[PDB]
């Protein structure tokens, strides 16, 4: 499914793909067990709905009734709650997101999969003590995962130590090059360092990995706006407008 989700690029493609899964798609009832081959009572088709519809931030349909259906069947699934927590995070609802994530750490203390958002929430919360716990605790497990080198960098950034935090973000990206979210964060730590030249390249790489990056365009637009080159930054902001027009911030 994940490789299938990756090849999708736009929301309109998902609607075309979603329809194909409904009208002219049927499973081999011989291989699969009974009462499962039905599309309406499957689980992977459901898990597809929560994944593609929200990671691409697409228009939701057949998504509400499926989500509560999955919470009933899977009450203790760690992946579901973290995804459920991420939904609140994606809607700029941080306080409720913290409560959802706090259950994950207590229930599952060793999960370096979605904690990158947890240490992201704590930085905005300014709960430096709680973040300092996580940096020491996460680093003790292993320092070779992409996330554990991103968890620490947030903690080092909160303490206004940028020349060290900038190092870990480059470290966090080297371990797994697919984590393009670290490019924009790596760019921010240069701007606070009063080094505009280095930041411009750092943001620019992020958009060249994938042009459909609202974070990268905005972070690149600001770096020019910090300088006096106000008009020169208009093009970058204009490009970011088309990506997420339905945003007050842009």
């Amino acid at each position: 499914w994940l490789e299938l989700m990756d090849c999708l690029q736009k929301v309109d493609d998902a609607l075309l793909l979603n329809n194909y899964l409904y009208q002219n798609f049927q499973f081999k009832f011989s291989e699969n067990l009974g009462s499962q081959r039905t599309i309406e009572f499957n689980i992977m088709i459901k898990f597809f709905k929560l994944k593609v519809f929200e990671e691409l931030n697409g228009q939701l349909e057949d998504y509400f009734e499926d989500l509560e259906f999955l919470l009933q069947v899977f009450p203790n699934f760690t992946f579901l709650k973290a995804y459920n927590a991420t939904i609140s995070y994606n809607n700029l609802d941080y306080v409720t997101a913290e409560s959802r994530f706090d259950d994950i750490v207590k229930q599952d203390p060793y999960r370096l999969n979605d904690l990158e958002t947890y240490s992201n929430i704590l930085y905005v919360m300014q709960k430096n003590s709680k973040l300092a716990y996580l940096a020491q605790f996460v680093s003790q497990i292993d320092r070779f995962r992409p996330e554990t080198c991103c968890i620490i960098a947030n903690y080092y950034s909160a303490r206004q130590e940028h020349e060290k935090s900038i190092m870990y973000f480059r470290r966090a990206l080297t371990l797994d090059k697919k984590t393009t979210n670290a490019w924009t964060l790596m760019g921010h730590e240069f701007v606070e360092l009063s080094n505009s030249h280095a930041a411009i390249e750092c943001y620019r790489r992020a958009v060249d990995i994938c042009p459909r990056d609202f974070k990268a365009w905005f972070g690149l637009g600001q770096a020019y706006a910090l300088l006096d080159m106000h008009l020169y930054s208009l093009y970058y902001f204009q490009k970011a407008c088309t990506l997420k027009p339905w945003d007050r911030r842009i």
Partner: protein, 96 residues
Amino acid sequence: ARALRDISLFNDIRKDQNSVKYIPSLSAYNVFNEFPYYPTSASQLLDGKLDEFLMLSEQYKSRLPKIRKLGWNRFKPIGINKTMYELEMLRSRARA
């Protein structure tokens, strides 16, 4: 770039009438130590652009004796309470 003085004419008339801070780049920062690389001389800075080959040449030249320099200072064997740094120091004084 004749500067108006390399021209023989205007150079002749004048005689008769008389009667850079450096900032690191993204590639400069390395992964192991958060201190960025600082070029030793302006020759390594090619028209304001840091030569990736030149900086990587000095890096190799620095790390090469560092392997040889391992035993100096802190390193101390068992049965000898004095390190090898001053083994050559007293050796230097021995002949001299």
